[PDB]
Coordinates of C-alpha atoms and ligand atoms in Angstrom, one line a residue:
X1 CA 0.0 0.0 0.0
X2 CA 2.8 2.5 0.8
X3 CA 5.9 2.2 -1.4
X4 CA 8.6 3.3 -3.8
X5 CA 8.2 4.9 -7.3
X6 CA 8.9 2.7 -10.3
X7 CA 10.6 5.5 -12.3
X8 CA 12.3 8.1 -10.0
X9 CA 12.1 6.1 -6.6
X10 CA 10.4 9.1 -4.8
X11 CA 8.2 7.4 -2.2
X12 CA 4.4 7.5 -2.7
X13 CA 1.0 5.8 -1.8
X14 CA -0.2 6.3 -5.6
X15 CA -0.4 2.9 -7.5
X16 CA -1.7 2.9 -11.1
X17 CA -4.9 0.9 -11.0
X18 CA -5.0 0.6 -14.8
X19 CA -1.6 -1.0 -15.1
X20 CA -1.8 -4.9 -14.9
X21 CA 1.1 -5.0 -12.3
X22 CA -0.3 -1.9 -10.3
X23 CA 3.0 -0.1 -9.9
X24 CA 3.6 2.7 -7.4
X25 CA 4.1 6.1 -9.1
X26 CA 5.2 9.4 -7.5
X27 CA 3.0 12.6 -7.6
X28 CA 5.0 13.9 -10.6
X29 CA 5.3 10.6 -12.5
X30 CA 1.7 9.4 -11.8
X31 CA 0.5 12.7 -13.5
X32 CA 2.7 12.2 -16.6
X33 CA 1.3 8.7 -16.9
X34 CA -2.5 9.5 -16.5
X35 CA -2.4 12.5 -18.8
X36 CA -0.6 10.7 -21.7
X37 CA -2.3 7.3 -21.6
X38 CA -5.8 5.8 -21.4
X39 CA -4.8 4.8 -17.7
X40 CA -6.9 7.1 -15.4
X41 CA -7.6 5.0 -12.3
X42 CA -5.3 6.0 -9.4
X43 CA -5.0 4.0 -6.1
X44 CA -3.8 4.5 -2.5
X45 CA -5.4 2.8 0.7
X46 CA -8.7 4.3 -0.7
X47 CA -9.0 4.6 -4.5
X48 CA -9.4 7.9 -6.4
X49 CA -13.1 7.5 -7.2
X50 CA -16.1 9.8 -6.6
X51 CA -17.3 9.3 -3.0
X52 CA -20.8 10.7 -3.8
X53 CA -23.4 7.8 -3.7
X54 CA -23.9 5.8 -7.0
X55 CA -21.5 8.0 -9.0
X56 CA -19.3 6.2 -11.5
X57 CA -16.5 8.9 -12.0
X58 CA -13.1 7.0 -11.7
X59 CA -10.9 9.2 -14.0
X60 CA -8.4 11.1 -11.9
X61 CA -8.5 14.2 -14.2
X62 CA -12.2 14.6 -13.6
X63 CA -11.8 14.3 -9.7
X64 CA -11.1 16.7 -6.7
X65 CA -10.3 16.8 -2.9
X66 CA -13.3 17.9 -0.7
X67 CA -11.5 18.1 2.6
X68 CA -10.2 14.5 3.1
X69 CA -12.6 12.9 0.6
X70 CA -12.8 12.6 -3.3
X71 CA -15.6 13.9 -5.7
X72 CA -16.1 14.6 -9.4
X73 CA -16.9 18.1 -11.0
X74 CA -20.7 17.4 -10.5
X75 CA -20.4 16.5 -6.8
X76 CA -17.5 18.5 -5.4
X77 CA -18.0 21.0 -2.5
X78 CA -17.1 24.7 -2.9
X79 CA -13.8 24.3 -1.1
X80 CA -12.2 21.6 -3.3
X81 CA -8.9 21.1 -5.1
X82 CA -8.3 19.2 -8.4
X83 CA -6.4 15.9 -7.8
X84 CA -4.8 16.4 -11.2
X85 CA -3.1 19.8 -11.4
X86 CA 0.3 21.5 -11.8
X87 CA 2.0 18.4 -13.2
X88 CA 1.1 16.4 -10.1
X89 CA -1.5 14.0 -8.8
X90 CA -2.4 14.7 -5.1
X91 CA -0.5 12.1 -3.0
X92 CA 1.7 11.8 0.1
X93 CA 5.3 13.0 0.2
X94 CA 4.5 15.5 -2.7
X103 CA 8.2 8.5 -18.7
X104 CA 7.4 8.1 -22.4
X105 CA 9.1 4.7 -22.1
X106 CA 7.1 3.7 -19.0
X107 CA 3.9 4.6 -20.8
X108 CA 4.7 2.4 -23.8
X109 CA 5.6 -0.6 -21.5
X110 CA 2.4 -0.1 -19.4
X111 CA 0.0 0.0 -22.5
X112 CA 1.6 -2.3 -25.1
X113 CA 0.0 -5.7 -26.0
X114 CA 3.6 -7.3 -26.5
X115 CA 2.7 -8.5 -30.0
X116 CA 5.3 -6.2 -31.7
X117 CA 9.1 -6.5 -31.8
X118 CA 9.4 -2.8 -30.8
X119 CA 7.8 -3.6 -27.4
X120 CA 10.7 -6.0 -26.6
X121 CA 13.3 -3.5 -27.9
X122 CA 12.0 -1.0 -25.5
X123 CA 11.9 -3.5 -22.6
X124 CA 15.7 -4.0 -23.1
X125 CA 16.8 -0.4 -23.9
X126 CA 15.1 1.3 -20.9
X127 CA 16.4 1.9 -17.3
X128 CA 17.0 -1.1 -15.0
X129 CA 13.7 -0.6 -13.0
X130 CA 11.8 -0.3 -16.3
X131 CA 13.4 -3.6 -17.4
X132 CA 11.9 -5.3 -14.3
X133 CA 8.5 -3.5 -14.8
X134 CA 8.5 -4.6 -18.4
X135 CA 9.5 -8.3 -17.5
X136 CA 6.7 -8.5 -14.9
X137 CA 4.1 -6.9 -17.3
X138 CA 5.0 -9.1 -20.2
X139 CA 5.0 -12.4 -18.1
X140 CA 1.6 -11.4 -16.6
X141 CA 0.3 -10.6 -20.1
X142 CA 1.6 -14.0 -21.4
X143 CA -0.2 -15.9 -18.6
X144 CA -3.6 -14.2 -19.0
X145 CA -3.4 -15.0 -22.8
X146 CA -3.2 -18.7 -21.9
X147 CA -6.7 -18.4 -20.3
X148 CA -8.1 -17.3 -23.7
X149 CA -7.5 -20.8 -25.1
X150 CA -10.1 -23.6 -25.2
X151 CA -10.2 -26.8 -23.0
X152 CA -9.4 -30.2 -24.7
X153 CA -11.2 -33.3 -23.6
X154 CA -10.4 -37.0 -24.3
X155 CA -13.0 -38.4 -26.7
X156 CA -11.3 -41.8 -27.3
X157 CA -8.0 -43.7 -26.6
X158 CA -6.5 -45.5 -29.7
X159 CA -3.4 -47.0 -28.0
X160 CA -0.8 -46.2 -25.2
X161 CA 0.5 -43.2 -27.2
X162 CA -2.4 -42.2 -29.5
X163 CA -5.8 -40.4 -28.7
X164 CA -8.6 -38.2 -30.3
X165 CA -9.6 -34.8 -28.7
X166 CA -12.8 -32.7 -28.4
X167 CA -12.3 -28.9 -28.2
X168 CA -14.2 -26.0 -26.5
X169 CA -16.3 -24.0 -29.0
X170 CA -15.8 -20.2 -29.2
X171 CA -12.3 -20.2 -27.7
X172 CA -9.3 -20.8 -30.0
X173 CA -7.2 -24.0 -30.0
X174 CA -3.5 -23.5 -29.0
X175 CA -0.8 -24.9 -31.5
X176 CA 0.0 -28.5 -30.8
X177 CA 3.7 -29.1 -30.3
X178 CA 6.1 -30.0 -27.3
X179 CA 6.3 -26.1 -26.8
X180 CA 2.8 -25.9 -25.1
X181 CA 2.7 -28.0 -21.8
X182 CA -0.9 -28.8 -20.7
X183 CA -1.9 -30.0 -17.3
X184 CA -4.1 -33.2 -17.3
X185 CA -7.0 -33.6 -14.9
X194 CA -4.2 -33.4 -11.4
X195 CA -3.0 -36.4 -13.5
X196 CA 0.3 -34.7 -14.4
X197 CA 1.5 -32.4 -17.2
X198 CA 1.0 -33.5 -20.8
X199 CA 2.1 -32.4 -24.3
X200 CA 0.6 -33.0 -27.9
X201 CA 1.9 -33.8 -31.5
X202 CA -0.2 -34.2 -34.7
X207 CA -6.9 -37.1 -37.2
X208 CA -4.1 -39.2 -35.7
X209 CA -2.8 -37.2 -32.7
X210 CA 0.0 -38.5 -30.2
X211 CA -0.3 -37.9 -26.4
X212 CA 3.0 -37.4 -24.5
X213 CA 2.0 -37.9 -20.8
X214 CA 4.7 -36.8 -18.4
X215 CA 3.1 -39.1 -15.7
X216 CA 2.1 -42.6 -17.0
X217 CA -1.7 -42.8 -16.5
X218 CA -4.4 -44.7 -18.2
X219 CA -5.8 -41.9 -20.5
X220 CA -9.4 -41.5 -19.2
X221 CA -12.2 -40.6 -21.7
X222 CA -13.9 -37.4 -20.3
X223 CA -10.8 -36.3 -18.4
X224 CA -9.5 -32.9 -19.7
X225 CA -6.2 -30.9 -20.0
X226 CA -5.6 -27.0 -19.5
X227 CA -2.5 -24.8 -20.1
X228 CA -0.5 -24.3 -16.8
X229 CA -1.0 -20.5 -16.2
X230 CA 1.4 -20.1 -13.2
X231 CA 1.2 -16.8 -11.2
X232 CA 3.7 -14.1 -11.9
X233 CA 5.6 -12.9 -8.8
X234 CA 7.0 -9.4 -8.6
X235 CA 10.7 -8.8 -9.5
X236 CA 13.0 -7.3 -6.8
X237 CA 16.6 -7.9 -8.0
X238 CA 18.0 -6.3 -11.2
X239 CA 18.7 -8.3 -14.4
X240 CA 22.4 -7.5 -14.0
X241 CA 23.9 -6.6 -10.6
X242 CA 26.1 -3.3 -10.7
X243 CA 29.4 -4.1 -12.3
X244 CA 32.5 -4.2 -10.0
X245 CA 36.0 -4.4 -11.3
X246 CA 38.8 -5.6 -9.1
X247 CA 42.6 -5.3 -9.3
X248 CA 43.1 -8.8 -7.7
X249 CA 41.1 -12.1 -7.7
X250 CA 38.5 -11.6 -5.0
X251 CA 37.1 -14.3 -2.6
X252 CA 38.4 -17.1 -4.8
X253 CA 41.6 -19.2 -4.3
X254 CA 43.4 -20.4 -7.6
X255 CA 45.7 -23.4 -8.1
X256 CA 49.2 -23.5 -9.8
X257 CA 48.4 -27.1 -10.8
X258 CA 45.5 -26.9 -13.2
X259 CA 45.6 -29.8 -15.8
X260 CA 46.9 -28.8 -19.3
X261 CA 43.3 -29.7 -20.5
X262 CA 42.0 -26.4 -18.9
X263 CA 45.1 -24.2 -19.3
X264 CA 43.7 -22.4 -22.4
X265 CA 41.1 -20.8 -20.1
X266 CA 43.5 -19.8 -17.2
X267 CA 43.6 -16.1 -18.3
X268 CA 39.7 -16.1 -18.6
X269 CA 39.2 -17.9 -15.2
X270 CA 41.4 -15.1 -13.7
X271 CA 39.2 -12.4 -15.5
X272 CA 36.2 -14.2 -13.8
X273 CA 37.7 -13.5 -10.3
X274 CA 38.5 -9.9 -11.1
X275 CA 35.0 -8.7 -12.0
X276 CA 31.6 -9.0 -10.3
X277 CA 30.1 -10.5 -13.5
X278 CA 31.6 -11.6 -16.8
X279 CA 30.1 -12.6 -20.2
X280 CA 31.4 -15.5 -22.3
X281 CA 30.4 -15.8 -26.0
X282 CA 30.8 -19.4 -27.0
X283 CA 29.9 -20.4 -30.6
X284 CA 28.9 -24.1 -31.1
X285 CA 31.5 -26.6 -29.9
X286 CA 34.0 -24.0 -28.8
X287 CA 34.2 -25.4 -25.2
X288 CA 31.5 -23.7 -23.1
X289 CA 30.7 -26.6 -20.7
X290 CA 34.5 -27.4 -20.6
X291 CA 35.1 -23.7 -19.5
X292 CA 32.2 -23.9 -17.0
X293 CA 33.4 -27.1 -15.3
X294 CA 37.1 -26.1 -15.6
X295 CA 36.3 -23.0 -13.6
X296 CA 35.7 -25.3 -10.6
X297 CA 39.1 -27.0 -11.0
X298 CA 40.7 -23.5 -11.2
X299 CA 39.1 -22.4 -7.9
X300 CA 38.9 -25.8 -6.2
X301 CA 37.5 -24.6 -2.8
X302 CA 34.8 -22.3 -4.4
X303 CA 31.1 -23.3 -4.0
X304 CA 29.5 -23.1 -7.5
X305 CA 25.9 -23.0 -8.6
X306 CA 25.4 -24.1 -12.2
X307 CA 22.0 -22.8 -13.5
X308 CA 20.2 -22.6 -16.8
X309 CA 16.5 -22.2 -17.9
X310 CA 16.1 -25.8 -19.2
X311 CA 16.5 -29.2 -17.6
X312 CA 18.5 -30.2 -20.7
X313 CA 21.1 -27.4 -20.3
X314 CA 21.4 -28.2 -16.6
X315 CA 21.9 -32.0 -17.5
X316 CA 24.6 -31.2 -20.1
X317 CA 26.5 -29.3 -17.3
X318 CA 26.0 -32.4 -15.0
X319 CA 27.4 -34.7 -17.7
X320 CA 30.6 -32.6 -18.0
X321 CA 30.8 -32.3 -14.1
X322 CA 30.5 -36.1 -13.8
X323 CA 33.8 -36.4 -15.8
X324 CA 35.9 -33.9 -13.9
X325 CA 34.4 -33.1 -10.5
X326 CA 34.1 -35.3 -7.4
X327 CA 30.6 -36.9 -7.5
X328 CA 30.1 -36.7 -3.7
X329 CA 30.3 -32.9 -3.8
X330 CA 27.6 -32.7 -6.5
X331 CA 23.8 -32.4 -6.3
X332 CA 21.1 -32.1 -9.0
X333 CA 18.1 -30.0 -7.6
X334 CA 14.8 -31.4 -8.9
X335 CA 11.5 -29.7 -8.1
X336 CA 8.7 -31.8 -6.5
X337 CA 6.5 -31.3 -9.6
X338 CA 8.6 -33.5 -12.0
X339 CA 7.4 -32.2 -15.4
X340 CA 9.8 -34.7 -17.3
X341 CA 12.9 -36.9 -16.5
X342 CA 16.2 -35.5 -15.1
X343 CA 20.0 -36.3 -14.6
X344 CA 20.1 -39.3 -12.1
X345 CA 23.8 -39.7 -11.1
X346 CA 24.2 -36.9 -8.4
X347 CA 22.6 -37.0 -5.0
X348 CA 19.1 -35.3 -5.4
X349 CA 18.1 -32.1 -3.5
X350 CA 21.1 -31.8 -1.3
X351 CA 21.1 -28.0 -1.6
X352 CA 24.2 -27.8 0.6
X353 CA 26.8 -29.7 -1.6
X354 CA 29.8 -27.7 -3.1
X355 CA 28.4 -28.1 -6.6
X356 CA 24.7 -27.5 -7.2
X357 CA 23.1 -28.0 -10.6
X358 CA 19.5 -26.6 -10.9
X359 CA 17.1 -24.9 -13.3
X360 CA 16.3 -21.2 -12.7
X361 CA 12.6 -21.8 -11.7
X362 CA 13.7 -24.4 -9.1
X363 CA 16.6 -22.4 -7.6
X364 CA 16.6 -22.3 -3.8
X365 CA 17.5 -19.2 -1.8
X366 CA 21.2 -19.5 -1.2
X367 CA 24.7 -18.0 -1.6
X368 CA 27.7 -19.1 -3.8
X369 CA 31.3 -18.1 -4.5
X370 CA 30.5 -18.4 -8.3
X371 CA 27.2 -18.7 -10.1
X372 CA 27.5 -20.0 -13.7
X373 CA 24.3 -19.2 -15.8
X374 CA 24.5 -21.2 -19.1
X375 CA 22.6 -21.0 -22.4
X376 CA 22.2 -17.2 -21.8
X377 CA 20.5 -16.6 -25.3
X378 CA 17.5 -18.7 -23.9
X379 CA 17.2 -16.5 -20.7
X380 CA 14.6 -13.7 -20.5
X381 CA 15.1 -10.6 -18.3
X382 CA 12.6 -12.2 -15.9
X383 CA 15.0 -15.2 -15.5
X384 CA 18.1 -12.9 -15.1
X385 CA 16.3 -11.1 -12.3
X386 CA 15.0 -14.4 -10.5
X387 CA 18.7 -15.5 -10.4
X388 CA 19.8 -12.3 -8.8
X389 CA 16.9 -12.6 -6.2
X390 CA 17.5 -16.3 -5.3
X391 CA 21.4 -16.3 -5.5
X392 CA 23.8 -13.9 -3.7
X393 CA 27.2 -14.5 -5.2
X394 CA 30.8 -13.2 -5.1
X395 CA 31.0 -13.7 -9.0
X396 CA 28.4 -14.4 -11.7
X397 CA 29.4 -15.9 -15.1
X398 CA 27.0 -15.7 -18.1
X399 CA 27.8 -18.3 -20.8
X400 CA 26.0 -18.4 -24.1
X401 CA 25.9 -17.1 -27.6
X402 CA 23.7 -14.3 -29.0
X403 CA 24.1 -16.0 -32.5
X404 CA 22.0 -18.9 -31.2
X405 CA 18.2 -19.2 -30.4
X406 CA 16.4 -17.0 -27.9
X407 CA 13.4 -18.1 -25.6
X408 CA 10.2 -18.3 -27.6
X409 CA 8.1 -15.1 -27.3
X410 CA 4.6 -16.6 -27.6
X411 CA 2.9 -13.1 -27.8
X412 CA 5.3 -11.7 -30.4
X413 CA 3.7 -11.9 -33.9
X414 CA 4.8 -8.7 -35.7
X415 CA 8.5 -8.0 -36.4
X416 CA 11.7 -9.9 -35.6
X417 CA 13.5 -9.8 -32.3
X418 CA 17.3 -9.1 -33.0
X419 CA 20.0 -10.7 -30.6
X420 CA 20.9 -7.4 -28.9
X421 CA 17.3 -7.5 -27.5
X422 CA 17.1 -11.1 -26.2
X423 CA 18.1 -10.0 -22.7
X424 CA 20.5 -7.6 -20.8
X425 CA 23.4 -10.1 -21.1
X426 CA 22.9 -10.4 -24.9
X427 CA 22.5 -6.7 -25.2
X428 CA 25.9 -6.2 -23.6
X429 CA 27.5 -9.0 -25.8
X430 CA 26.2 -7.3 -29.0
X431 CA 27.0 -3.7 -28.1
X432 CA 30.2 -3.6 -26.0
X433 CA 31.2 -7.2 -27.0
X434 CA 31.7 -10.1 -24.7
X435 CA 34.3 -10.2 -21.9
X436 CA 35.6 -13.5 -23.3
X437 CA 35.2 -15.3 -26.7
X438 CA 35.9 -18.9 -27.5
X439 CA 37.3 -18.6 -31.0
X440 CA 37.9 -22.3 -32.0
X441 CA 35.1 -24.6 -33.0
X442 CA 36.2 -28.3 -32.3
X443 CA 32.9 -30.0 -33.4
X444 CA 32.2 -29.2 -37.0
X445 CA 33.8 -30.0 -40.3
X446 CA 35.5 -26.8 -41.6
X447 CA 32.8 -26.3 -44.3
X448 CA 30.2 -25.6 -41.6
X449 CA 32.6 -23.5 -39.4
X450 CA 33.5 -21.4 -42.5
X451 CA 29.8 -20.8 -43.3
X452 CA 28.6 -19.7 -39.8
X453 CA 31.9 -17.8 -39.1
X454 CA 31.0 -15.5 -42.1
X455 CA 27.2 -15.6 -41.4
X456 CA 27.0 -14.7 -37.7
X457 CA 30.6 -14.3 -36.2
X458 CA 32.2 -11.6 -38.4
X459 CA 34.8 -14.2 -39.6
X460 CA 36.2 -14.6 -36.0
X461 CA 35.2 -18.3 -35.6
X462 CA 38.0 -20.7 -36.6
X463 CA 37.9 -24.5 -37.5
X464 CA 39.9 -27.0 -35.6
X465 CA 38.6 -29.9 -37.8
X466 CA 39.6 -30.2 -41.5
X467 CA 36.8 -30.0 -44.2
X468 CA 35.1 -33.4 -44.0
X469 CA 34.0 -33.5 -47.7
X470 CA 30.7 -34.9 -46.3
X471 CA 28.7 -31.6 -46.3
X472 CA 26.2 -31.3 -49.1
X473 CA 23.6 -28.8 -50.2
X474 CA 20.6 -29.1 -52.6
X475 CA 18.4 -26.3 -53.8
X476 CA 14.9 -27.8 -53.9
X477 CA 11.8 -25.8 -53.2
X478 CA 9.4 -28.8 -53.5
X479 CA 5.8 -28.4 -52.4
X480 CA 4.7 -26.7 -49.2
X481 CA 1.7 -28.0 -47.3
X482 CA 0.4 -27.0 -43.8
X483 CA -0.9 -28.7 -40.7
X484 CA -2.8 -25.6 -39.5
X485 CA 0.4 -23.4 -39.7
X486 CA 3.2 -25.9 -39.0
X487 CA 4.6 -26.6 -42.5
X488 CA 5.4 -29.8 -44.4
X489 CA 7.4 -30.4 -47.6
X490 CA 7.0 -34.1 -48.7
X491 CA 9.1 -33.6 -52.0
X492 CA 12.1 -32.4 -49.8
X493 CA 11.6 -35.6 -47.7
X494 CA 11.4 -37.6 -51.0
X495 CA 14.8 -36.1 -52.0
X496 CA 16.2 -37.3 -48.6
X497 CA 14.9 -40.8 -49.1
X498 CA 16.6 -41.0 -52.6
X499 CA 19.8 -39.7 -51.1
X500 CA 19.7 -42.3 -48.3
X501 CA 19.5 -45.2 -50.8
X502 CA 22.7 -43.9 -52.5
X503 CA 24.5 -43.0 -49.1
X504 CA 23.7 -45.8 -46.6
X505 CA 26.3 -44.5 -44.0
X506 CA 23.7 -41.6 -43.5
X507 CA 21.3 -44.3 -42.1
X508 CA 22.5 -43.0 -38.6
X509 CA 21.7 -39.3 -39.4
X510 CA 19.4 -37.1 -37.3
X511 CA 16.6 -35.4 -39.3
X512 CA 16.3 -31.7 -38.5
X513 CA 13.8 -29.1 -39.7
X514 CA 12.3 -25.8 -38.5
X515 CA 8.8 -27.5 -38.2
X516 CA 7.3 -30.3 -36.0
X517 CA 4.9 -31.3 -38.8
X518 CA 7.8 -31.8 -41.3
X519 CA 9.6 -33.9 -38.6
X520 CA 6.5 -36.1 -38.0
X521 CA 6.2 -36.9 -41.7
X522 CA 10.0 -37.5 -42.0
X523 CA 9.8 -39.8 -39.0
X524 CA 7.2 -42.1 -40.7
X525 CA 8.8 -42.0 -44.2
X526 CA 12.6 -42.0 -43.4
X527 CA 12.5 -43.7 -40.0
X528 CA 15.4 -41.4 -38.8
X529 CA 15.3 -39.8 -35.3
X530 CA 13.8 -36.4 -35.6
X531 CA 14.5 -33.0 -34.0
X532 CA 13.4 -29.3 -34.5
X533 CA 16.2 -26.7 -34.8
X534 CA 15.1 -25.2 -31.5
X535 CA 15.1 -28.6 -29.7
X536 CA 18.5 -29.5 -31.3
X537 CA 20.3 -26.6 -29.6
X538 CA 23.1 -27.7 -27.2
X539 CA 23.2 -31.2 -28.9
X540 CA 25.6 -32.8 -31.4
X541 CA 25.3 -35.6 -33.9
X542 CA 27.7 -37.3 -36.4
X543 CA 25.3 -36.8 -39.3
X544 CA 22.5 -34.3 -39.8
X545 CA 19.9 -34.1 -42.5
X546 CA 18.3 -30.7 -42.6
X547 CA 15.3 -29.8 -44.8
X548 CA 14.5 -26.0 -44.8
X549 CA 10.8 -26.9 -45.6
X550 CA 9.7 -23.2 -46.4
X551 CA 11.3 -19.7 -47.1
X552 CA 9.5 -18.0 -44.1
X553 CA 11.1 -15.5 -41.7
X554 CA 11.2 -18.5 -39.2
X555 CA 13.0 -20.9 -41.5
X556 CA 15.4 -18.2 -42.9
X557 CA 16.3 -16.9 -39.4
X558 CA 20.2 -16.7 -39.4
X559 CA 20.4 -17.8 -35.6
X560 CA 18.2 -20.8 -36.4
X561 CA 20.2 -21.5 -39.5
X562 CA 23.5 -21.3 -37.5
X563 CA 22.1 -23.7 -34.8
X564 CA 20.9 -26.1 -37.5
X565 CA 24.1 -26.6 -39.4
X566 CA 26.4 -26.5 -36.3
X567 CA 24.8 -29.7 -34.8
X568 CA 27.0 -31.9 -37.2
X569 CA 30.4 -33.4 -36.2
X570 CA 31.0 -35.2 -39.5
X571 CA 28.5 -34.5 -42.3
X572 CA 25.4 -32.6 -43.2
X573 CA 22.9 -32.6 -46.0
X574 CA 20.9 -29.4 -46.4
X575 CA 17.9 -29.4 -48.7
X576 CA 17.3 -25.6 -49.1
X577 CA 14.3 -23.4 -50.1
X578 CA 16.0 -19.9 -49.7
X579 CA 18.5 -19.0 -52.5
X580 CA 20.4 -16.6 -50.2
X581 CA 21.2 -19.2 -47.4
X582 CA 21.8 -21.9 -50.1
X583 CA 24.4 -19.7 -51.9
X584 CA 26.2 -19.0 -48.6
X585 CA 26.5 -22.7 -47.7
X586 CA 30.2 -23.6 -48.4
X587 CA 29.2 -27.2 -49.3
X588 CA 29.4 -29.4 -52.4
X589 CA 26.1 -29.0 -54.3
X590 CA 24.2 -32.1 -55.3
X591 CA 22.1 -32.6 -58.5
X592 CA 18.4 -33.8 -59.0
Ligands
NY7_601 C1 29.9 -19.6 -50.9 O1 31.1 -20.3 -50.8 C2 31.2 -21.6 -51.3 C3 30.1 -22.3 -51.9 C4 30.3 -23.5 -52.3 C5 31.6 -24.2 -52.2 C6 31.8 -25.6 -52.7 C7 32.6 -23.5 -51.6 C8 32.4 -22.2 -51.2 N1 33.5 -21.4 -50.5 C9 34.6 -21.9 -50.0 O2 34.9 -23.1 -49.9 C10 35.5 -20.9 -49.4 N2 36.0 -20.0 -50.4
ZN602 ZN1 8.4 9.0 -10.0
ZN603 ZN1 -1.0 2.5 -15.8
ZN604 ZN1 -19.5 12.3 -8.7

């Protein structure tokens, strides 16, 4: 009820009642909000509404102070002062960017640009507002009910009339009814139940709309530079394996926070785990948004760090499987691996936040609120994929606007850059180096002579909006007959519907570009499927072709990206 101004910090009792997060505003800033926007409801212990019986005047510009009460122009007493006058709204202890964050619908790219270019408190206001908007949008969707059960993995659904149907992919996680979370993939639909239960007919699912908590901590803590390693104790016996990162590990101990840009296969988790060997007494918390990113850090830690000092933090609501080898939920172990939403309230000597392109400003802030650390390290790559922005439908979100860490990496550059790709055949490294890394990424591997490209537009069909290209899958099938070593390839495309078709026709394991991020395979077969902004996205393209260790086959739709691929072209 009585708090601090989200703009200039000048204490007040005035909260905007029209803002979905109800932020406190000072006398000066509340005025500049109500007179420039449709937002006219002003709060305190008592709201600014006409006290005269049965009067519906709530607009603060049409209200006045009659002693210690509030009334409109039609009900005010002779001795009454306007609540809105002289650039101020009457309150105790007596902006363009704040207005736009407060009133935008978050469907445009410019809304996200602003949410990242504004002041720090406006970043938290923006992150709270966006997350709250995203959750209330889930409520707009229709309830799905089980009509019949075909088998242990297939079912038929009945939808609510009037309310739209959400897109079916492993992106949208429903909550069965409390029979556990469930996901869907396309009249022959497949049901992916997180908890194994006999799919009851009549039982329904609904999109988990968790409540949005307020943000207290900043996205980035204030930067501190030191002239000596602070609170960390190095070794002069770090294995040659991690010696390439000694100068960077020291930079970590000489700054409050540091950023690491690591292109694919340049040694990000090797750097992250090697930081524990360089400061062997330090308590380190390894965090990331996804369970898969946390698990990939667990796998590297399992190889170099003592297993008895490790613990994998798993929340009670087990939404999918997790890394099994560390002791579970022992919050007190020297090494703690946990997702951002499951983080306990604790301290650390170092906090490592991985896959930073997937973080939102909300995630950056939660980490600063749940973890108080001597040093924070942000590992990721702004040339890789960002978190899906479900409300964003107009415009494209550039990497400098993914989050505060990405913004720093794209404007002032990263503190540390891993320049040598050790995963990919040089054809791939040379392509992405020119495409997204300003020719600064170098190849450790030779050219494999197993990277191919084919320009084939085929025929584009759609499953609602998720696209399919059966002729591009036909070309893959023909290629497989002539190149049987490729029988072990992973099939990748920008669309679930393309992947579902390729799975039945080719029999290859399937993966979307977005779900492939962080993973590597010997052989990759990629079909572009369409020439949309989604399938032409250079960060998505970069992720797609950098999954391969040995060979890649790219069936392309876009001439531009095809021409850039430094691969042997194939005929047909
Ligand atoms: C657009 O570049 C290419 C396209 C196709 C092939 C076979 C090679 C290159 N470029 C190189 O191998 C580096 N000069
Ligand atoms: Zn203010
Ligand atoms: Zn408002
Ligand atoms: Zn009135």
